[model samples]
Target: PEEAIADLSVNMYNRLRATGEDENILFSPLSIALAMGMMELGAQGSTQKEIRHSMGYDSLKNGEEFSFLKEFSNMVTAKESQYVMKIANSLFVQNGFHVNEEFLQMMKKYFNAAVNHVDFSQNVAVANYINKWVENNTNNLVKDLVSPRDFDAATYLALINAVYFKGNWKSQFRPENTRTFSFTKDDESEVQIPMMYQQGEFYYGEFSDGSNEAGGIYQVLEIPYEGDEISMMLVLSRQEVPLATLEPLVKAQLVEEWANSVKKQKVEVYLPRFTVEQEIDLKDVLKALGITEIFIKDANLTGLSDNKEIFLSKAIHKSFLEVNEEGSEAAAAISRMAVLYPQVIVDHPFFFLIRNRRTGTILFMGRVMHPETM
Candidate 1:
């Protein structure tokens, strides 16, 4: 499921980038997968098939996705107090709707989610309630997950998920070393931002397809979190090219290759101190992936409710990430050993994702186009 979700993540990234927006991109592939898992639980026929195919889940055996989601959650949910990773899921059903008991139970078993009855007619009230739930689950990092505009009398079920991650670097950057740096946005706009600095060993690699297809040259840098269970992977096109030139070449296989290939080496890092948040309307996102039947009238959602008319009207996801100085050693002794560490200065637009190293589960993914904007 982790590997399958990577394909879906890249696909979503491409679809959004194709729109030609210069704004920041932040969305969780795992959250989308969980939201779809909720719908797939109640879905049958073509409705389910479209989602499975879009998510690369068609190859799984019948009824196997449930277990896959369960274990995927377990692997990356967080095991120590060193880092914070929270995943919250919910099925907001219309007041007085009759959802299948088996479906509700399965959702709990697989997703650890519960069904909640809310008056969609009171859009403000329900939206407020769910948003608060999102806030509490995300350590207040993500406060608003939905709004009244997202709900209506016609709204019956909302499959929502929220993910939040915060991990201090395994090799923390000292505050004094952070300095004002320049960042170039894709729009040719440049801004001065505070850049976090560190010099230490890290997983690093330089990749290109030997052609213009993948921007000719690019760098991959991995910064591990405390305890080394998870890390952040940054893929930056050589300073001369636009990230657009390299993005289309990204594939599921390429992601794995980078993970396996990058070798540990000394590095000098200058990352921007920034935080990014995005509230995604999964309805719009899913449609871009060719998942439409689940939103149509008379959609098959009988697994959640016996009312044939009730279908998924909203699927919302919000992810938050904060990158700053973490706790490392002084550079005096290390500098004496001779530091020719390659420098990884993330001072421009680049792509990044946080993941669990052991299980290869991506918790969050986005690109930082302008550090000052968000």
Candidate 2:
């Protein structure tokens, strides 16, 4: 399951980059997996098979993917003292529509999904209801995930997934050490941002394959959160290289290699205090990935309802991630050591991901092309 998810994670990043070349990319691959899983619960025939293949889930025996997804859900939803991770799923069906009881039960049992029956034809009210639901679940971080344009009189079901994560770094940066600094963009332009500075022992390494083809001498820095279970690995191309030169090298195998290659060492780190929020139409994203059957009128959703006409009309994904110095009372999160440190400045667009170290699953994946833009 982790293997399939890693492939999906990187593939989506690539797909996302193709259009918004200079935009800040941020989305939860884990949440998208859950959205597809929720849809799969009500899917039939090619709709299921296409999802299975596109997500790299074809290797799993039929009916077994749910168990793998449920396993990861339980593992990720657990709240530790160091952090809180939430994977919130909901299904809003058209009023007066009859859905199979077993399918809803499957949602609860496997995806922990909540069900609601609403009159989608009243698009304004339904959109407000869903947006408020999204805001509450996301801690108000993502207030407007959907609008009336997302629904119509013909709409039936809307599958939504919202992910919100907040945590303290293992070594909390001091607020006093944070100062406004210039960030270099891919176009060689610059913007001012509050860069948090810290000297801590982090997993760090300089990677190169000798050919200088993979963005020669790129640096990878792994900064652990309050708990050792999760960390954000930041990768940067050498000072002279643009991020586009290094984008093609990202793959699941390379991610695994980086986890094994980086060594724990003292280092000087400067990272921006930034928050990334995004609203994605998962319907289009999945279609671009070749899972198109589910959106068409002929979609086999008999598992959801006896109506051969029922098909998905909405798959909206919204997520929020914040990186800042600790304001909480976890002052002891950082222990000091006196040593000369190698410095790594994240003053440019770079690829970064928050992943669970124990299960090797990526919770969030994105690249920052500009510091202030979402």
Candidate 3:
């Protein structure tokens, strides 16, 4: 599961980056994978093959893989002493579709998902219900995830995933120390943004992809939350290099390498207090990743339902993140730190990922081109 999570992280980032959004970017590879994994149970032949291969589950026994996923979900959802991290998955089926009992049972057993019967013919009511479910699960961070227009009479099922995480810094940043700072955008434009400051010792490391200048030197900083169970990894490239140049170089193994190589060092850190929300229609992104058959009419989903007309109509993903002086209200032990340290100003574009420290599963990741935009 960790290997698959890593692959999905870099793959999804690369695919979305190819779109050239040049704005606040965010998504949960873990949430999407879980949602898709549930969908795979209803698929057969080519439809199942494409999803399994794209998700890096081709080699695993179905029963064993799902059992692991069930355990993984439990571990993540288990009570944490100092933070809130939750992953939710659901299946909204059209009223007329006769879903197979085996498929429904598998989803409930492994994914802990419930089957919701809705009338797609009345799209507005169904959309509102699904959107409300998203809002409630995400602690009101995500709303209106499914619009009325996203559904139609032919729409059979909408696979939705939402993740909510709120964690406070182990060492809280003093609001008095936070002030306006100049942040350079990818287009060489500068804007004044609220940058929070904290002087403490953190796990930091600097490394180069290669020896050459064009190869680019980058820095990785790990800022742990109140609970040591989760932390945020920030990757910043040289000032002269565009973020796009370094994004493609990212891989799951490289993230682990950074974690292993990082050392605790005294450093002054500056990060923007920003909120970013991203809603992605994964139909195209999944197609770009070679998981296409499920979205079209020729798709085979007989395993999920006896009705051949039943097919996936929507694959929606939404994510939200905020960094400020007060992290989540939860509390945990704090490591002692030095007063004075080297300075690391995060004034330029960079990439950041939030993940579980123990299992090494990346929950959310994105590139921030302009922090002020969100």
Candidate 4:
């Protein structure tokens, strides 16, 4: 099951990147996982209510559906909910320097609307809520990622989302470093992009194959606090050879291998820091990723309930990420405060991910391109 999850996750990443070849940021996979985890937990509490209601008895016949729901309920224990929610919340809070109140309110409202009005017993209900959340949360930056009413409502219910990011150098590059850099495209064309450069000690490494013609970097930037509630991690990776070289090398197994083999080096790095944003319609992405079976009429999301009249009605995704070196003179959350030192220096584009570290899930992934432009 974990393998299935990982495969779905990596493939989604690949597909989204491939689909929109030049996107700078994406959060779909993380968003979907979080949604699934939430639905898994919420269904438990909802099932408890359903069982207590008279309609609960009418909804179940042989208990096979009820049995599945019951098993799922037990699997997501109180401790699990707390643990999972905590990690999700950390990611939610970590990405943005300041939390958006409207986004939070919309999330709460849509969440309540789905569980309260939509019949989770049907797949359509799930899809509807997912769509609502995406459209509402991103201020409509994404649309029809899931139809507001795309669920079958008579079969199954499921949820999906992902995380994305692209930030520029906090400090915009100087004319001297902006030069004609070689890039290889899928069509096998070589072009020179305005590549930026910087010389300093950074958290980065490279591939061993000389013919491989690629280099990767890891830059670590710290977000200073106005008080105690804020901090950051800006990590950037650039393709020394070609952008095409990065994806095939970025798989679950490769990730683990990189974690084990990436030897941190104190080397001078050159990279072009840029920012990117994307809004993806996740429905097609998920179906294409092999989750087709569950979304079909014979779907097995019975854990949602014994009600055969339920199915995932929608799936939507929206995300934004920005990285820079300009230290905030004032705090974005709670109160206005100042950083002790104003002059902060970033050496190279490197990798950074924010985590509660208690759980292995990442909260935010980023890169520092400049200290002033972020």
| Better structure of 2 and 4 per lDDT | 2
**CA RMSD for every model?**
2.6, 2.9, 3.3, 13.2
Model 2: pairs clashing at backbone N, Cα or C within 3 Å: none
Descending-lDDT candidate ranking: 2, 1, 3, 4
lDDT by residue for model 1 (47-131), tens: 8888777776789866665555755566445555458777778889888889889988877777767788888899899889988
Which candidate gets the maximum lDDT versus the true structure?
2
Query: On a 0 to 100 scale, what is the lDDT of residue 354 in model 1?
Result: 79
Query: What are the per-residue Cα lDDT tens digits for candidate 4 across 251-368?
Result: 5565444444534333333444344334555556655543444344444334444444443444445555543232222211311222311221223323334322222233443222
Lowest lDDT block of 10, candidate 1 = 326-335
Angstrom error at residue 227, model 3: 1.8
Model 3 lDDT tens row, 118-222 = 887787988898888777776777777888888754687888877766677866788898999999888999999999988765788888956576646788888
Point out the higher-scoring one by TM-score: 3 or 4.
3
As a whole number from 0 to 100, the lDDT of residue 196 in candidate 1 is 85
Clashes of each: 1, 0, 2, 65
Instruction: Give the top-scoring candidate (TM-score).
Output: 2
Q: What is the lDDT of candidate 4?
A: 0.37
Candidate 1 Cα errors over 4 Å, as ranges: 75-77, 212-216, 328-339
Score candidate 1 by TM-score against the native: 0.91
TM-score of each: 0.91, 0.92, 0.90, 0.46
Q: After superposition, how far is residue 350 of candidate 4 from its true place, in Å?
A: 11
